[PDB]
Amino acid sequence: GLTEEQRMMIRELMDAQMKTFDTTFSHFKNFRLPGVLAAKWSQVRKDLCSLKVSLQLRGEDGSVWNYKPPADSGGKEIFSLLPHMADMSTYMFKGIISFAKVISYFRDLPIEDQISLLKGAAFELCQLRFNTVFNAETGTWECGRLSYCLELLEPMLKFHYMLKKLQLHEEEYVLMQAISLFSPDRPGVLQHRVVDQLQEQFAITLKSYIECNRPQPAHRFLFLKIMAMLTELRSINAQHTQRLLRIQDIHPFATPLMQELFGITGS
Ligand SMILES: CC(C)(c1ccc(O)c(Cl)c1)c1ccc(O)c(Cl)c1
Numbered sequence: 297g298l299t300e301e302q303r304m305m306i307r308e309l310m311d312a313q314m315k316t317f318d319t320t321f322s323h324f325k326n327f328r329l330p331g332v333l334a335a336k337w338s339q340v341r342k343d344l345c346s347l348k349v350s351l352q353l354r355g356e357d358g359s360v361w362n363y364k365p366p367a368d369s370g371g372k373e374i375f376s377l378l379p380h381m382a383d384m385s386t387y388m389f390k391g392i393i394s395f396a397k398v399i400s401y402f403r404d405l406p407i408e409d410q411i412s413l414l415k416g417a418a419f420e421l422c423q424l425r426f427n428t429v430f431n432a433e434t435g436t437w438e439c440g441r442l443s444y445c446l447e448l449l450e451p452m453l454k455f456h457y458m459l460k461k462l463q464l465h466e467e468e469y470v471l472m473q474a475i476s477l478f479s480p481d482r483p484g485v486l487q488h489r490v491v492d493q494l495q496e497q498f499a500i501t502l503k504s505y506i507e508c509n510r511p512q513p514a515h516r517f518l519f520l521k522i523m524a525m526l527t528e529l530r531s532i533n534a535q536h537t538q539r540l541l542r543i544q545d546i547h548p549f550a551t552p553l554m555q556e557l558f559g560i561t562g563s
């Protein structure tokens with residue numbers, strides 16, 4: 297029941313996802329790992345209290361490495377996972393950038409808007425991709441041979457847990473990535489009218505997809521719930537951006553690609 301234009305729209309989105317999302321994380325290599333063996337700091341202490349996650353490393357030979365993070369005791373041990381998380385966020389950013397650069401609607405935009413759209417949404421599309429590998433039963437993000445296990449009040453798990461409950465299709469996840477990518481009200485966007493029109497289509501296609509393929513009573517209002525997530529994911533964008541900048545101020549860790557996406561000039 298989709299138009300032919302809507303059908304081709306989903307197929308290009310699925311095609312970009314197919315090409316730029318390494319669901320097995322096979323090419324995530326050479327990453328750093330935790331070492332072996334004033335009112336600011338008190339806020340960064342509270343900030344880093346969500347990164348406390350254990351880390352599992354299953355080798356091809358069958359060996360397994362597990363890391364259990366320390367407990368906060370007023371020192372620098374609270375930064376032990378920052379170098380590794382930065383490498384993973386960077387690998388995730390490269391794939392998100394590759395995702396956008398394949399989409400025709402994205403390439404046709406001016407280069408200054410392409411940069412602005414990526415800067416404003418890169419983190420959101422990363423969270424949407426992580427949710428597809430999130431295991432809500434074990435509280436673990438199964439990233440191929442890597443596993444991030446947790447040691448709902450903290451908004452970005454409430455997001456991940458709720459989004460998994462809706463139990464979406466691959467087509468619905470990638471349509472969400474497009475709506476969040478093509479947000480016309482990011483800082484610095486100039487073709488606001490052109491990007492808003494594109495964003496609308498993506499949203500109307502997602503609405504039509506749900507109504508043609510999901511008649512069950514459990515999926516009543518499903519389109520409106522997704523749009524609520526995206527608004528909620530945008531809020532979690534920005535409150536995590538703040539959190540990032542605060543940790544970076546006292547304890548630098550952001551990679552060059554991260555600095556570029558978060559406006560850090562390096563000076
Ligand atoms: C450094 C890291 C991974 C981080 C830092 C503290 C936290 O509590 C969590 Cl959950 C995650 C991060 C934070 C915000 C971002 O936008 C990006 Cl890309 C990366």
Ligand SMILES: CC(C)(c1ccc(O)c(Cl)c1)c1ccc(O)c(Cl)c1
Binds near residue numbers: 346347426453
């Ligand atoms: C999905 C994951 C592993 C994550 C989140 C943001 C990132 O930038 C990276 Cl690299 C990885 C995560 C970790 C701790 C948390 O508290 C939550 Cl909500 C989510």
